[PDB]
Amino acid sequence: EKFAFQAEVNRMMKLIINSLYKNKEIFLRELISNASDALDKIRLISLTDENALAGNEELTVKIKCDKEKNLLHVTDTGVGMTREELVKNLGTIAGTSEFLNKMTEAQSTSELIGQFGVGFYSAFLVADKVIVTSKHNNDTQHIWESDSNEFSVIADPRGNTLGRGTTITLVLKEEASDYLELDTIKNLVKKYSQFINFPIYVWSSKTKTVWDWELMN
Amino acid sequence: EKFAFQAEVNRMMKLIINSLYKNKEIFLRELISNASDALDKIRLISLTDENALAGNEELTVKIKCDKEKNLLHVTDTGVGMTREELVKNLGTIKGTSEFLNKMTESTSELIGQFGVGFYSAFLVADKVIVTSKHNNDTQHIWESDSNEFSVIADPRGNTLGRGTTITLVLKEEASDYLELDTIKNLVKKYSQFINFPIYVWSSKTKTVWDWELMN
Numbered sequence: 001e002k003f004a005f006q007a008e009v010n011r012m013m014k015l016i017i018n019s020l021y022k023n024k025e026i027f028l029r030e031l032i033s034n035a036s037d038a039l040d041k042i043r044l045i046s047l048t049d050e051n052a053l054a055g056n057e058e059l060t061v062k063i064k065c066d067k068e069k070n071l072l073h074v075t076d077t078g079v080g081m082t083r084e085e086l087v088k089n090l091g092t093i094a095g096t097s098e099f100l101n102k103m104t105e106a107q108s109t110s111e112l113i114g115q116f117g118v119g120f121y122s123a124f125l126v127a128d129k130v131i132v133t134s135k136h137n138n139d140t141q142h143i144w145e146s147d148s149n150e151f152s153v154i155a156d157p158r159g160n161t162l163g164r165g166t167t168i169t170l171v172l173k174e175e176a177s178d179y180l181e182l183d184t185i186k187n188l189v190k191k192y193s194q195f196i197n198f199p200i201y202v203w204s205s206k207t208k209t210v211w212d213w214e215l216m217n
Numbered sequence: 218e219k220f221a222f223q224a225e226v227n228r229m230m231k232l233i234i235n236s237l238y239k240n241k242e243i244f245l246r247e248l249i250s251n252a253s254d255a256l257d258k259i260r261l262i263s264l265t266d267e268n269a270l271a272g273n274e275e276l277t278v279k280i281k282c283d284k285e286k287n288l289l290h291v292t293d294t295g296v297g298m299t300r301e302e303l304v305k306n307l308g309t310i311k312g313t314s315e316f317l318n319k320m321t322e323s324t325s326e327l328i329g330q331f332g333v334g335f336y337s338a339f340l341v342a343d344k345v346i347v348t349s350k351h352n353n354d355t356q357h358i359w360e361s362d363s364n365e366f367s368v369i370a371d372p373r374g375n376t377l378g379r380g381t382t383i384t385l386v387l388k389e390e391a392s393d394y395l396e397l398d399t400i401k402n403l404v405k406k407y408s409q410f411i412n413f414p415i416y417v418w419s420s421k422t423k424t425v426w427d428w429e430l431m432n
């Protein structure tokens with residue numbers, strides 16, 4: 001259940017963290033962007049697979065803040081990942097050599113990271129820990145967690161609560177506490193969701209005080 | 218041949234690098250202290266083993282600056298390490314649980330107290346190489362950039378006889394440690410109380426090079 005990252009991934013995390021410390025908010029752009037890719041995938045699969053969406057009919061991204069627990073959640077109903085895919089996709093990597101060289105050489109790298117598709121790791125810019133809960137049509141719900149020094153995968157004792165999809169949960173660093181404020185999240189989400197072809201919601205309040213999903217794009 | 222560090226070691230390296238960020242020269246103190254501890258060990262073994270010192274009759278620490286190659290070498294003739302010991306002592310970590318918590322909660326003394334000062338070489342080095350020859354094994358080489366490490370049989374064979382050479386590929390901004398003046402100075406400070414003789418390969422005035430005793 002306990003694994004170690006591939007060497008090149010440790011290097012990649014360091015390059016990303018060191019070259020973006022000046023524009024941390026980008027982590028949110030990357031999470032929403034990965035959410036959108038996952039949503040496109042299940043959509044492509046639903047063209048050939050008639051049972052594709054049976055686990056969860058919607059195709060959405062739902063963002064929620066939990067100030068009391070110091071948590072930020074970003075949930076999408078994309079294709080999700082199997083246990084083997086969590087271990088492979090997040091703990092290893094496969095023209096990587098050049099990318100690292102370009103990153104190192106460049107060291108703006110915001111565009112580089114997006115183009116290569118390794119934006120997930122920019123989550124370590126604001127999080128002391130990253131948790132990935134996923135449910136893929138071909139497997140049971142699993143959980144991936146990491147503080148960047150190793151990672152582990154376990155079967156989710158809660159069972160299948162996602163239906164289909166992925167939740168990226170971030171345990172925010174103390175200095176990243178500002179991302180727990182609704183005003184800030186709504187503003188960032190709105191900016192980074194303008195060109196995403198799937199509805200994106202943020203759990204927010206409204207005037208008694210009532211909480212409910214608020215469309216951002 | 219390729220290995221990954223234990224999770225605890227990765228955490229430890231970060232804790233050590235982030236706390237001593239303002240007093241980097243301390244890496245030299247730790248390398249010399251570890252050198253010393255390796256010598257005490259072979260000295261002890263030699264008390265109960267007539268052939269202990271057969272591979273190399275001396276008990277010393279020799280420091281060498283290779284400016285051109287950007288390398289710093291620290292060689293001792295202690296007990297050395299087998300292939301299995303390089304992998305275990307350097308890639309895994311002992312009351313570690315509490316130490317990490319204590320580090321998190323000055324760290325200079327703490328690191329010295331737990332004996333994990335080796336990792337402070339990463340404060341001034343982009344890559345760290347450890348060549349070692351133990352009586353019970355052939356010479357091997359351990360190398361790391363901190364993101365992983367590998368251990369290979371030393372193709373040069375037994376050149377140490379017995380002992381360990383710590384080789385640091387100095388970061389561009391750590392280049393100051395390649396100056397004889399500076400290393401001589403630091404060595405003289407952290408060697409005042411080391412029971413074994415410590416030498417620095419230095420020049421004297423024509424210009425000749427030779428071992429100069431610093432303690």
Ligand SMILES: COC(=O)c1c(O)cc(O)c(Cl)c1CCC(=O)Nc1cc(O)c(OC)cc1O
Pocket residue numbers: 030031034035037038039076078079080081089090092093094117118119120121165166168
């Ligand atoms: C499979 O895509 C996902 O389910 C998904 C998601 O829905 C939200 C996310 O924030 C992320 Cl990170 C993912 C996984 C994206 C992916 O394709 N995995 C992946 C991630 C990497 O960092 C990577 O680095 C080389 C390679 C990957 O395949």
Ligand SMILES: COC(=O)c1c(O)cc(O)c(Cl)c1CCC(=O)Nc1cc(O)c(OC)cc1O
Pocket residue numbers: 247248251252254255293295296297298306307309310332333334335336380381383
């Ligand atoms: C075995 O001791 C050595 O031969 C030696 C040496 O001669 C010079 C050195 O710079 C070092 Cl690091 C060593 C190894 C010291 C040791 O006993 N191993 C060791 C080193 C660590 O850094 C450590 O960290 C948790 C644990 C160890 O056991």
